[PDB]
Structures are given as structure tokens and as C-alpha cells.
Amino acid sequence: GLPVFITPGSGQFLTTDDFQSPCALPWYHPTKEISIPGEVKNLVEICQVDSLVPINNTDTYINSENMYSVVLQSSINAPDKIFSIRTDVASQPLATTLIGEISSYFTHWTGSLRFSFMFCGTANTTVKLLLAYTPPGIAEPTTRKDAMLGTHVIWDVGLQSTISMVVPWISASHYRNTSPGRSTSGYITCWYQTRLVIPPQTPPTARLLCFVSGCKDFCLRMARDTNLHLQSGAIAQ
Amino acid sequence: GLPVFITPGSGQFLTTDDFQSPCALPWYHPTKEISIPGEVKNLVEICQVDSLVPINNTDTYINSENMYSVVLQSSINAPDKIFSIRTDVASQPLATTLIGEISSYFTHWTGSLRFSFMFCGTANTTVKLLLAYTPPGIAEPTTRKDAMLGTHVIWDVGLQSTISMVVPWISASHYRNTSPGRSTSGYITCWYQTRLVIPPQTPPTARLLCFVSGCKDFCLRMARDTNLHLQSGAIAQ
Amino acid sequence: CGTANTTVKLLLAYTPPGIAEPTTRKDAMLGTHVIWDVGLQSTISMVVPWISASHYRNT
Amino acid sequence: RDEMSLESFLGRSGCIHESKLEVTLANYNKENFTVWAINLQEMAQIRRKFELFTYTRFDSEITLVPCISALSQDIGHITMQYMYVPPGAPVPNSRDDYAWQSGTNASVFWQHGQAYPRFSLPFLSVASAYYMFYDGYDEQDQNYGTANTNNMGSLCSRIVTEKHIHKVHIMTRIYHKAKHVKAWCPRPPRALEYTRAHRTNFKIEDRSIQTAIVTRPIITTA
Amino acid sequence: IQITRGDSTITSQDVANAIVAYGVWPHYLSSKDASAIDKPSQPDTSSNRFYTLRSVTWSSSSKGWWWKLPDALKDMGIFGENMFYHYLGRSGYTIHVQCNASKFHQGTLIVALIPEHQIASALHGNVNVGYNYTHPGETGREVKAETRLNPDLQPTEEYWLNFDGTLLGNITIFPHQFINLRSNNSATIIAPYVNAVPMDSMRSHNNWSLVIIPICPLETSSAINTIPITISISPMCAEFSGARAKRQ
């Protein structure tokens, strides 16, 4: 009939192939589709959702909602530096957040992240927090001064319980490896510009929340298996 | 379905075949390409680059920069003939040059070569060198006279430190075998038309450099493995 | 004032008021300066600008 | 000049790696699987060719040629599983590791009498090209020369069948072919024997430096 | 003539018979090639001037010298600071090599600019070149016979093998210029940034490497039998990213 020449690779089963295959139920007409709200089409949709960062991941608060908040003091003797976290999507604490989890399912990432903060204090409690970003390459600041000498924000809580700041994408290559780096990672440091000021008969302390999501330019490439979930159990039915 | 007839050769793996094959990472979008200066598209580009000929390939200068230069004398008793070299791209000394190395990676060659010379003397040192080419077939000249009776050049160094001469392509067949021939190879001979003339308080000797590259008409065919590099080692990682 | 065959490279540098004169060739070339190659040009000029708090300064 | 194009010079296929696997009776898992970090610098001939440029970019075509040898006791039918693990993904370390069934990796099953396996890989680096040379250092300021962006993944192989195993030898020649090649910044050809991978080192112990330059007695005689 | 660039100005540069590495002129990173989408801007003519290293002495026994860029300029005012206070950076250069001699001196130099010049270690075995030795700074690296320290960290001294196992004389495949004393006494190379990525850690990766080998030994009958080789380097379209607080 028609002269054909078989090519190297024929008959092989490549788990990542893409060919047609006979339908086992050719006559069956599948149930119609209906309108279910919330269709997701791209994982980026999930990455742009702010999720709480377990900022206070110490042994004391490890398995409680307290691992998601930091306690701000009003006493004059609390250390200037409040908390610090690396900016690599896959590094702790970010790792276990929404964007962190989806990122752990890929090998290359790129883009900017958006950190948002919420002051869980009283309506009369005011304070000035210094939120500073440190580019990759240099070790995180050690004093309020050094911190404000770099890029930062003097956030005045009274009158605005929320604020966001965008960490830019600074890298040699277009996309960077999904695995956490220390010398190749940035830092987010929070400092007391002033302590908590409050009127009489008011809680001397207040909590602080931290959120994170990717921006429009956030993107992932080359899927791998997440390492945030290790299954070593029965899974008995 | 569609009647087919399998042809002799099917399923075979011909190392020089050219067929499509399933992508193992069909979803992966490779890193964009950026503008890196110096893109090479053809090996001919490398062959048209003048490179120094190890003209003085003796045991005395063998592993030093002295193997790339010839010393010209100003004393009246230095032999008329200075140096001589065969013109076949793959023969020594040419072999180890740029064009020689790339040529050793093929079996057939053709085209003209361009020899360039540089006088490494003093600004007041002058001399007349006789550069002569000898076509394949005849044994290299033995006297300055015989040499000038053929094609040649009386190069007067004073006032022009450089000069080039083109060795033409003289062959029975279009392309010739890449392996060096003696009776089928030409010769480049250099002679003293006059010795080195210099003023007082001046180096009595001066060096001479020799370059070589292919012309526009230079071309190679039927790739083989270079024999200028023999790997008989560990290559331990 | 050398010979026609004598050549050299001199580094002429200006130092603004305020700082103490350079002490090493490097420091000197890090500021405003000129690498003057004598061979082929026996002359060269450089202009020292007017840097002062007031318009005119005391003589 | 068509045969002098990069595509013709570097685009030819060659055996970049020989992979031998032997059936071992003591433990089922053992080290029956074989893992190899893809590297085109292992073969001198192939290396010297690529090292003719500073930066190169290209897609790949891997072809596998399995050679089974049965010492005795038949065991004729065995199923082989070749797997490609992308850069950064975890490699298997046991014949039954989870990696072998993961979907992010690419696997191809081959049972004797089947056409030779073959698949393609796109340009893998995170940079815009592969570094043939690197005048740089590690993040720790160590292991200078090698480039991390150059990682190309690993080729793994395991015998899938179970007990029909009667101590048989498996040879798998791996042929690679650079496709759609691009190169930048030509360099002089390697003149000495290679001694290390990812290093231009050339000095060999108790041996004189030997070039391709052949010496002659007198320069007046060609 | 004289090329005055910034507060620096070098005389004797003359006409423009210099070489432009790989035919590409130094340019600012285009947004299309940029790594982080695009940056608003990066215009800064502050680091664009001439830094003149100390002149090296060329004697009748000199075998060679080499410097690495940007390393050589790590301590040159603005540029040096910039590359120290930034995570990433890219830059082209205008290397200007010139030596003072007379019509009674003879010699020839090969001035080559090699991209990704990966040096080979001096010893045999499982050794490798140590950070300190490939980052000599503006002092450069001179070919010496004397024995040195951390020997197994030292790079090769085989200049005729281009310090990397290739043959000198093939080194002409890289952007270069010959300096034949009886003809010219200077060379100039204008090279753009070369790498497989937009920018990089200037601290850990030396893009270009300036090599200078005397192919024809220096000879003369003068009292002092040696001449000086002056090197002036000028950054071209220098750009930096990830700036950090200084004086901290």
C-alpha cells in the first residue's frame, strides 16, 4: 500500500507523550456540564491570594494560631528589632503559605512578592513601625538606623491598620532555583520606630499579622514534587 | 485503516539519521535567549583569522614563545636561506594553527591560504627579505637565485613592518585530501636579499613573525576526527 | 625641556580646597588629573577652576 | 560551506555515556538502579569540539541502545525503565524509590525486541546558554570553573521485572545529539590532554608537557 | 590627540584605530533582555572615566602579565565602590595599553582580551585554583619563576599555553592587538559585556581577562634596558542592581 519507514522510538511508552487512544466507552454520552462557581484555570490565581505567614515559628507557638502573629510591646525596654524573615518563596516561614506551597511544586520561580501587614491592636493604640527590605547579597540589618538607611517604610499604625510593600525581583538569571538560598535571598525586617502608645485602661500589648502573595509578574517553571509533604504512612482504605 | 508497507531499514537506529522525537518536557518553556556578542555560525569564520605559525619548531625552542619567531642576523656570514615550510594546511608547522586545527577535523580541503609576516625589529633596522612560493611538483629552492626566478616578493622592511602574500590553489582535483603530501605540496621559502642593516647602539638581531589564514575560497568537506588531539588519559571527574 | 627622543608619562593632578594634597600616585589619579604623554607634544595646559564660598576671596 | 555550519560540526550524535547494570541476588533493591548526571564533557573528542566556543545553546536528542547479555538460565524477557530526572528534582537512591513513578519526571519503558528508545530535551539552563568555560567561583568561593546553571539533569535506569532475574548483564549506550545549535566567542583548540572535568588543568605527574607540534632538526628544510 | 572622559584625561590616545571586541559596541541592557522585566532606568555617567593602573616594567626576561575584569578595578573609586555596594552588575570597558619606547627599542606584545578566561592550576592531581589568586586586584599577575604559597591553589605559569592548555599563537582568535614597537606603541580594545546572563555577581565572576604576552623579547642598548607599559581602563555603560547601605 503506502511505503512507511519506522522511526527510532516507535512502540515505546514515554510517560510524557501525547497521543490519541481508542475510547473504551465510545457510545457513552457523559453527563452535561453545569455552572459551578469558582473555576480555576491557572495556578497563578492561587498565588495571588494573600495568606498568613507563620512569622512566629518558634517551639513555643509552633502548633497554635499564635505562630501567625507577633506581639508588640509598649514598654520602653523591648529590643528595637521585632522580627525578620527571608524573602525566598520556598524558605521558612513563607514555605508553608499558599504561594510557598504552590512554589514548592516547581523548580524555577521569578517575580515580585507582596507583603501586607495588619495591626491587631486597639482603636486608640498607636505606634510607628519601620518595615525594611534588604536586597540579596548583604546580611540583614542589625540596628534601626542601618535598616532605615536602606529601602524602608515608616508605617504609622494609628488611622490605617494595613499597609503593603512590594519586594522586587533581583536576580542574575531570569528565573531562579526554587530551593532556598541565604546569600541569594533578601530580608524583611521589622523595627520599632516608637513603642506602643496607649491611653489608660488599655491592653499594654497588641498583635501584628503578616501576609504574602505574588504579583502579576510572579511565575513558576519546571514542575517537580513538593517536598513540604512527605507521605510515609499506610493510607489504608 | 490505511494500508501501509514497511520498508527495509525500519526500526533501525542509524546514528546519522534525522527524525523527530517526543519531547520529554513538553510543558517546560526554556529560558529566553539574550544577545551575547560574538555568535559564530560557520567554522569558516574561524579559518579566516590569522594565527601565528610555530615556524621555529625545533627541539631548542619547542615549548616556548620562541617557536613562533625566527631570528634575523645582521652579520655578513649568515646562510642565505632563513626558513622554509610546506603549504599544506595539515602539515607541520601549519597543523597546530587555527586553520590547521579546524582542517584536521575534515578530510577534504580547497582554497587559497594567506601568509602574513611581521618584522619585530627596531624602527631604524632595515632589511630586504625575499619571500618565495614554490608550486607543488618541484623540490624547494636551494639558492636565492632559483628562489627569485619563481614567483616571489622582495619585501623591504624599513617603512612597512607587514606584508602578505597569497598561496593559490593548485590541484588536479577540486578538493584535495586533508592529509599532508610532500610531492603534492607547495613551499614557502624566506631568503636574505640583504642582511640586517642598523645604526650604532642597536640590537644586532631582530625577530620575524609568520601568520596564516584561509581566504574567501577556503573550504572543507567530509568531517573526521582530528588527529592533533589524542586522548589517552583518565579525565577523572 | 627634554630631548626629541626622550619620552615619559607625567600625571598632573588638581586637588580642590578642603582636602590635604595627595600622597600617592593612585590617590592623585583618583581625583581630577591628566596623564600627559610628553613624546610628540612638549606642551600641555590645564585650568584650575574657581571654587569658593564667596564670590571673591581674600588675596 | 554548509557542512562547516555549527549544526554540522556539533549537531552530530555521539556516545556520551556507557551505562552498565548487573543483576545482584543479595538484595532486591541493592544498587540495581543506575543514576548518571548528564554531562557532555566526559568524552575528550566531544569535549574538545564544544570547547571551541565559550557559550553554546542547543536542544537535545537522547537515543538509548540497550544490550542484554544472559550468562545462563534464560531470563530472556525483561522490562527496562529509563527515567530522566530534570535539574533540581530529587534522584532515586533505591530500585523502588518513589522517584520511579513520579509524574514530573519522564520515563520510557523498553522491552527487548522493541525499537530503540528516543526522546528530546529542550534547552535546560536558567541562563541563556551553557558555559563551556567559567572564570568564576561558587557562592562559597570554591569549586571555581564549574557553573551551577549548566546542570542538565540525570538519566536513570532500573530493571522492572521481579524474580525472573538470573544474574544478567545490561549495557546501555547513551547517544546524544545537539539540535538547533548556537555558539558564541570562539577559543583556540585544546592542545593538551584533559585531566579533570570542569577544569582546564593540564599538568600531569612525572610526565613532560606534550603538544601536537612535531619538531624538526633544521628550519631551512621543510 | 587626547581622550578626556570624566575628570580624567589620557593624552596619546590619538586616532580611532582600536579594536571593538566581537564587533559589538558597549551598550546598556535593553529591557527585552533584562532579567527582572524592566528597570525604570540606569543612567549614570559617574563611573565612566579612566582608571590608570601602575605601569608594569617590561624587561628582557618578562614572560607575561594578566589582569581580570572587573576584579582589577575593585578598588578604583566610584566603580570599585559601586561594585562593592551592589549585588549585581554588568559593564563593558575601554582598555588602553601603551608603552613608552624610542626608535632604538624593539619588541612586540600581544594584547588580548579573553572572555571567560578559566585558568588552569599549576600542580598535577586533584587541585584547583584558589579565589585569592584569580583576584589579584589592580596589581595583576606577573609570570614568575620564584616558588609561591598554597601551591596547589596557585594558577599555572605556562604563558605559552595561554594559562589554560591552548597554544599561544592561536590566542589571536580573541579580540586583540599587536604592539610592534617599531610601528605602534599602543593598542586599544573596546569590549562590551559578555556573559550568558544580563548581570552578575562581579565579586564571584570575572567576565573579561586582559592578557599581555611578549611574543618578541624586548631588546635595546639604552642605559636602563627596560620600558614601562601603562594600562588605562574605562568602564562602559556600567549598570548595577540591588544596592545596599554604605558606611554602615
Side-chain angles (χ1 to χ4, degrees), chain A residues 1-75 77-237, chain B residues 1-75 77-237, chain C, chain D residues 2-27 30-72 74 76-163 165-166 168-222, chain E residues 1-10 14-37 39-41 43-145 148-243 245:
Chain A
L2 181 281
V4 297
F5 195 80
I6 298 170
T7 288
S10 292
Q12 69 171 34
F13 170 41
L14 181 60
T15 60
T16 58
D17 76 12
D18 188 2
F19 304 119
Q20 305 173 64
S21 32
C23 204
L25 295 196
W27 290 102
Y28 180 70
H29 178 199
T31 307
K32 63 181 170 187
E33 194 185 314
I34 62 179
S35 301
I36 308 176
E39 196 185 320
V40 180
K41 303 211 175 193
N42 202 81
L43 286 182
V44 70
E45 291 176 49
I46 294 181
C47 297
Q48 296 170 173
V49 181
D50 281 308
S51 48
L52 284 171
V53 178
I55 215 78
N56 211 181
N57 57 326
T58 70
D59 286 318
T60 307
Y61 313 109
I62 188 51
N63 282 348
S64 68
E65 66 306 331
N66 294 307
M67 70 185 321
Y68 289 115
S69 51
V70 165
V71 178
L72 298 182
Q73 232 74 192
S74 61
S75 62
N77 64 176
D80 275 58
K81 190 178 190 174
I82 294 172
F83 76 87
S84 164
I85 63 172
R86 262 146 65 231
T87 66
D88 268 37
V89 292
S91 64
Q92 297 298 315
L94 292 183
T96 39
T97 68
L98 284 183
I99 189 169
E101 291 278 13
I102 280 65
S103 291
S104 292
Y105 266 115
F106 293 74
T107 313
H108 304 167
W109 72 289
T110 186
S112 304
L113 306 179
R114 194 186 69 143
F115 292 85
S116 315
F117 302 76
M118 186 183 281
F119 181 73
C120 269
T122 209
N124 290 312
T125 295
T126 182
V127 63
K128 277 177 179 292
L129 297 176
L130 193 165
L131 277 37
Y133 170 63
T134 301
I138 163 64
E140 59 175 305
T142 45
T143 78
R144 187 199 64 77
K145 184 177 182 184
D146 289 311
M148 85 95 198
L149 285 182
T151 62
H152 71 299
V153 183
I154 261 65
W155 171 34
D156 192 308
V157 172
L159 294 177
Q160 77 166 312
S161 317
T162 300
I163 196 165
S164 298
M165 88 175 310
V166 182
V167 175
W169 177 246
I170 302 174
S171 171
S173 56
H174 190 174
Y175 285 67
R176 247 222 298 151
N177 198 290
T178 204
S179 185
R182 70 216 70 58
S183 43
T184 48
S185 176
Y187 292 100
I188 279 282
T189 39
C190 188
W191 313 71
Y192 282 116
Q193 175 51 58
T194 67
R195 263 54 175 181
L196 241 49
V197 179
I198 55 180
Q201 311 287 303
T202 297
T205 62
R207 265 86 178 312
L208 183 57
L209 258 40
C210 187
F211 301 77
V212 68
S213 73
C215 290
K216 337 74 184 181
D217 68 324
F218 187 68
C219 197
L220 281 52
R221 274 174 28 197
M222 187 151 85
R224 53 163 299 177
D225 302 70
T226 189
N227 56 291
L228 277 58
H229 184 77
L230 25 280
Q231 183 69 187
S232 286
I235 205 170
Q237 310 179 302
Chain B
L2 181 281
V4 297
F5 195 80
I6 298 170
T7 288
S10 292
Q12 69 171 34
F13 170 41
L14 181 60
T15 60
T16 58
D17 76 12
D18 188 2
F19 304 119
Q20 305 173 64
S21 32
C23 204
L25 295 196
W27 290 102
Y28 180 70
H29 178 199
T31 307
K32 63 181 170 187
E33 194 185 314
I34 62 179
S35 301
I36 308 176
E39 196 185 320
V40 180
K41 303 211 175 193
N42 202 81
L43 286 182
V44 70
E45 291 176 49
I46 294 181
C47 297
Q48 296 170 173
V49 181
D50 281 308
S51 48
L52 284 171
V53 178
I55 215 78
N56 211 181
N57 57 326
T58 70
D59 286 318
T60 307
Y61 313 109
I62 188 51
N63 282 348
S64 68
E65 66 306 331
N66 294 307
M67 70 185 321
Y68 289 115
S69 51
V70 165
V71 178
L72 298 182
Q73 232 74 192
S74 61
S75 62
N77 64 176
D80 275 58
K81 190 178 190 174
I82 294 172
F83 76 87
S84 164
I85 63 172
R86 262 146 65 231
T87 66
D88 268 37
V89 292
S91 64
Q92 297 298 315
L94 292 183
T96 39
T97 68
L98 284 183
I99 189 169
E101 291 278 13
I102 280 65
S103 291
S104 292
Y105 266 115
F106 293 74
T107 313
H108 304 167
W109 72 289
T110 186
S112 304
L113 306 179
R114 194 186 69 143
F115 292 85
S116 315
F117 302 76
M118 186 183 281
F119 181 73
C120 269
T122 209
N124 290 312
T125 295
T126 182
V127 63
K128 277 177 179 292
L129 297 176
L130 193 165
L131 277 37
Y133 170 63
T134 301
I138 163 64
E140 59 175 305
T142 45
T143 78
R144 187 199 64 77
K145 184 177 182 184
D146 289 311
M148 85 95 198
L149 285 182
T151 62
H152 71 299
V153 183
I154 261 65
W155 171 34
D156 192 308
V157 172
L159 294 177
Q160 77 166 312
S161 317
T162 300
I163 196 165
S164 298
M165 88 175 310
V166 182
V167 175
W169 177 246
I170 302 174
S171 171
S173 56
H174 190 174
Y175 285 67
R176 247 222 298 151
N177 198 290
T178 204
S179 185
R182 70 216 70 58
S183 43
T184 48
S185 176
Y187 292 100
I188 279 282
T189 39
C190 188
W191 313 71
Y192 282 116
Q193 175 51 58
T194 67
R195 263 54 175 181
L196 241 49
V197 179
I198 55 180
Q201 311 287 303
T202 297
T205 62
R207 265 86 178 312
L208 183 57
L209 258 40
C210 187
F211 301 77
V212 68
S213 73
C215 290
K216 337 74 184 181
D217 68 324
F218 187 68
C219 197
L220 281 52
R221 274 174 28 197
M222 187 151 85
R224 53 163 299 177
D225 302 70
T226 189
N227 56 291
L228 277 58
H229 184 77
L230 25 280
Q231 183 69 187
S232 286
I235 205 170
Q237 310 179 302
Chain C
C1 269
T3 209
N5 290 312
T6 295
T7 182
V8 63
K9 277 177 179 292
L10 297 176
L11 193 165
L12 277 37
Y14 170 63
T15 301
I19 163 64
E21 59 175 305
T23 45
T24 78
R25 187 199 64 77
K26 184 177 182 184
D27 289 311
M29 85 95 198
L30 285 182
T32 62
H33 71 299
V34 183
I35 261 65
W36 171 34
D37 192 308
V38 172
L40 294 177
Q41 77 166 312
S42 317
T43 300
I44 196 164
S45 298
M46 88 175 310
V47 182
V48 175
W50 177 246
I51 302 174
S52 171
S54 56
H55 190 174
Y56 285 67
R57 247 222 298 151
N58 198 290
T59 204
Chain D
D2 189 49
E3 186 172 2
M4 289 176 73
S5 57
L6 283 181
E7 199 64 12
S8 170
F9 192 55
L10 302 167
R12 312 235 175 165
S13 92
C15 186
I16 63 177
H17 185 62
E18 206 93 50
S19 188
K20 57 187 177 183
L21 189 180
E22 280 170 33
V23 177
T24 179
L25 317 171
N27 16 308
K30 280 244 188 176
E31 185 169 47
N32 279 351
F33 60 104
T34 82
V35 177
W36 180 65
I38 303 175
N39 168 55
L40 320 190
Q41 240 183 51
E42 299 192 347
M43 308 300 224
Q45 287 68 287
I46 294 179
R47 178 171 174 172
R48 200 178 105 114
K49 271 162 170 284
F50 281 86
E51 288 198 359
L52 222 53
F53 311 84
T54 300
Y55 308 110
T56 55
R57 188 199 170 88
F58 60 77
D59 299 308
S60 304
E61 173 191 286
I62 304 301
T63 300
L64 274 26
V65 179
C67 309
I68 311 174
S69 308
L71 167 51
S72 185
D74 288 319
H77 261 69
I78 62 174
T79 305
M80 284 272 74
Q81 192 199 318
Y82 294 109
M83 176 174 71
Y84 169 78
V85 187
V91 161
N93 42 50
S94 58
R95 182 193 153 299
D96 13 61
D97 198 302
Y98 163 63
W100 299 109
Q101 53 178 298
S102 165
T104 79
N105 299 321
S107 305
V108 59
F109 295 82
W110 180 84
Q111 50 186 316
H112 86 65
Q114 184 191 303
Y116 304 94
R118 163 182 288 175
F119 60 82
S120 293
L121 290 174
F123 177 60
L124 306 170
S125 181
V126 241
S128 287
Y130 293 123
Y131 290 77
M132 299 298 91
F133 292 73
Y134 186 73
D135 189 8
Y137 281 90
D138 195 357
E139 305 197 5
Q140 322 153 12
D141 286 336
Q142 299 169 349
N143 306 350
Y144 150 103
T146 68
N148 37 309
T149 61
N150 264 22
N151 182 180
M152 282 177 252
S154 310
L155 262 301
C156 312
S157 64
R158 41 115 72 143
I159 176 61
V160 187
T161 55
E162 217 65 302
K163 291 289 79 67
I165 56 96
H166 297 157
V168 302
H169 180 235
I170 296 298
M171 186 62 73
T172 321
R173 304 197 114 225
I174 300 182
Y175 281 76
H176 170 274
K177 179 178 180 296
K179 298 205 288 190
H180 308 82
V181 183
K182 285 208 171 194
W184 294 268
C185 306
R187 318 165 66 76
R190 177 72 177 186
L192 299 174
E193 265 192 57
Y194 287 114
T195 62
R196 289 289 166 180
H198 309 293
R199 305 184 208 170
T200 41
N201 290 23
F202 59 68
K203 193 64 181 62
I204 287 182
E205 176 174 53
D206 289 320
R207 275 178 55 186
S208 182
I209 299 182
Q210 186 61 64
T211 319
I213 300 169
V214 185
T215 66
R216 50 208 253 252
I218 187 176
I219 59 170
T220 65
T221 301
Chain E
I1 89 168
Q2 43 194 50
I3 317 306
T4 171
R5 186 190 182 76
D7 54 353
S8 65
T9 153
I10 59 173
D14 200 339
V15 177
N17 46 299
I19 265 54
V20 177
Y22 294 119
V24 179
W25 198 278
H27 58 63
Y28 278 107
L29 184 49
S30 70
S31 57
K32 169 175 52 65
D33 280 42
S35 196
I37 289 188
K39 181 178 67 173
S41 296
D44 47 56
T45 311
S46 51
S47 46
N48 287 37
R49 50 158 279 167
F50 283 110
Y51 296 97
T52 311
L53 320 178
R54 176 190 298 81
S55 300
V56 316
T57 301
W58 179 6
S59 65
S60 60
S61 53
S62 297
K63 289 305 177 181
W65 307 270
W66 62 253
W67 290 258
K68 291 189 175 302
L69 291 176
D71 173 74
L73 307 181
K74 62 185 175 183
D75 287 72
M76 300 303 240
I78 292 307
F79 191 75
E81 297 169 359
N82 274 320
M83 81 157 74
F84 175 91
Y85 289 121
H86 285 76
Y87 177 41
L88 310 179
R90 61 178 269 129
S91 172
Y93 314 79
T94 282
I95 310 177
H96 208 112
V97 175
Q98 42 180 170
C99 47
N100 305 266
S102 73
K103 296 185 180 307
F104 287 73
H105 288 74
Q106 61 175 62
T108 303
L109 298 177
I110 301 182
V111 186
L113 230 221
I114 308 171
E116 299 301 327
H117 190 202
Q118 181 173 164
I119 307 307
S121 46
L123 296 174
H124 56 68
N126 190 63
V127 299
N128 205 312
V129 188
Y131 189 83
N132 305 308
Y133 310 96
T134 72
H135 288 68
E138 57 183 301
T139 310
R141 175 88 179 196
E142 181 180 64
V143 178
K144 296 181 185 180
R148 20 250 294 198
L149 319 310
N150 310 295
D152 48 321
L153 292 177
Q154 289 298 336
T156 191
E157 299 281 343
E158 304 298 1
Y159 59 100
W160 60 281
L161 278 173
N162 293 311
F163 303 106
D164 78 312
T166 50
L167 279 173
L168 172 67
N170 271 338
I171 184 167
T172 57
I173 185 64
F174 297 120
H176 66 299
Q177 286 242 268
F178 277 89
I179 290 187
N180 200 173
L181 290 185
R182 60 120 51 188
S183 279
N184 51 87
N185 60 173
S186 69
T188 311
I189 295 180
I190 302 173
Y193 185 63
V194 174
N195 206 325
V197 297
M199 298 196 170
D200 216 355
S201 172
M202 318 215 87
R203 216 196 77 73
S204 302
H205 186 199
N206 288 142
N207 322 300
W208 294 100
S209 195
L210 177 63
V211 182
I212 296 180
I213 314 298
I215 194 69
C216 282
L218 172 68
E219 302 173 61
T220 181
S221 296
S222 305
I224 70 172
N225 67 306
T226 70
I227 62 178
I229 299 180
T230 323
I231 301 175
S232 291
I233 304 172
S234 173
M236 298 277 281
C237 307
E239 294 190 59
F240 298 94
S241 178

